[PDB]
Amino acid sequence: TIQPGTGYNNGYFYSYWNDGHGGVTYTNGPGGQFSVNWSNSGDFVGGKGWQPGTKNKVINFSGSYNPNGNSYLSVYGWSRNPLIEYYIVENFGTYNPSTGATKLGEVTSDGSVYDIYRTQRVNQPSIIGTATFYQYWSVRRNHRSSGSVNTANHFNAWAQQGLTLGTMDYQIVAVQGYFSSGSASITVS
Ligand SMILES: O[C@@H]1[C@@H](O)[C@H](O[C@@H]2CO[C@@H](O[C@@H]3CO[C@@H](O)[C@H](O)[C@H]3O)[C@H](O)[C@H]2O)OC[C@H]1O
């Protein structure tokens, strides 16, 4: 397993962040593979990808994802100027992260319709420190743990709806969890 932090592993950028609560282990495997095992964890986010990401990347992911409680499997990343945290959610556990969020449209991509939403984080942690910033979401209706994500279809739909992205920071396939349990093994390319 590895310490929380960022870096490169077998050619892929990785980010593993947690709240220090314990109960979660993250491991970097060969190529674009990573595994997450958690049991009564706290808040955490980890996965592999790129730094920086691009606005036209076709991301391939494959493996298993078995959450028991609150967790998401997503293409996840950020932009700067404006600061935006974004998600293309392929699967989740007990909580749909768009619950209560205002719907801003639909986009069809890679075999499913996705619902689009915008939320706001107020004085929360970010890649640039504590801040208030928006979050963009595409939530897949047809849940899966393998597939291909044509990021451009999402970024373009978001733009069309008034959700613009700044300069890309990291872009990864991530397993996020919030006080839950589970296991996942994902390969990115
Ligand atoms: O040391 C700093 C890092 O901690 C920082 O990392 C990012 C912090 O925000 C993370 O995003 C939130 C983590 O908490 C969850 O509950 C929220 O849902 C996520 O929005 C992000 O994943 C980290 O990369 O980056 C800057 C460093 O200086």
Curated annotation (Swiss-Prot):
Enzyme class: hydrolase
Catalysed reaction equations from the record: Endohydrolysis of (1->4)-beta-D-xylosidic linkages in xylans
Glycosylation (residues): 37, 60
Domain GH11: 1-188
Keyword annotations: Carbohydrate metabolism, Glycoprotein, Glycosidase, Hydrolase, Polysaccharide degradation, Pyrrolidone carboxylic acid, Secreted, Signal, Xylan degradation
Subcellular location: Secreted
Influence of pH: Optimum pH is 4.5-5.5. Stable from pH 3.0 to 8.5 at room temperature and from pH 4.0 to 7.5 at 40 degrees Celsius.
Active-site residues, Swiss-Prot/TrEMBL: 85 (nucleophile), 176 (proton donor)
Residues noted as binding substrate in the record, renumbered to the chain: 72, 76, 87, 121, 125, 135, 170
Transmembrane portions of the chain: none
UniProt record similarity statement: Belongs to the glycosyl hydrolase 11 (cellulase G) family.
A GO-annotated cellular component: extracellular region
The protein's name in its UniProt record: Endo-1,4-beta-xylanase 2
Function in brief: Glycoside hydrolase involved in the hydrolysis of xylan, a major plant cell wall hemicellulose made up of 1,4-beta-linked D-xylopyranose residues. Catalyzes the endohydrolysis of the main-chain 1,4-beta-glycosidic bonds connecting the xylose subunits yielding various xylooligosaccharides and xylose. The catalysis proceeds by a double-displacement reaction mechanism with a putative covalent glycosyl-enzyme intermediate, with retention of the anomeric configuration. Produces xylobiose and xylose as the main degradation products.
GO MF: endo-1,4-beta-xylanase activity
Induction pattern: Induced by D-xylose, dependent on the cellulase and xylanase regulator xyr1. Repressed by glucose through negative regulation by the crabon catabolite repressor cre1.
GO BP terms in the entry: xylan catabolic process
Pathway in which the depicted protein is active: Glycan degradation; xylan degradation
EC number: 3.2.1.8
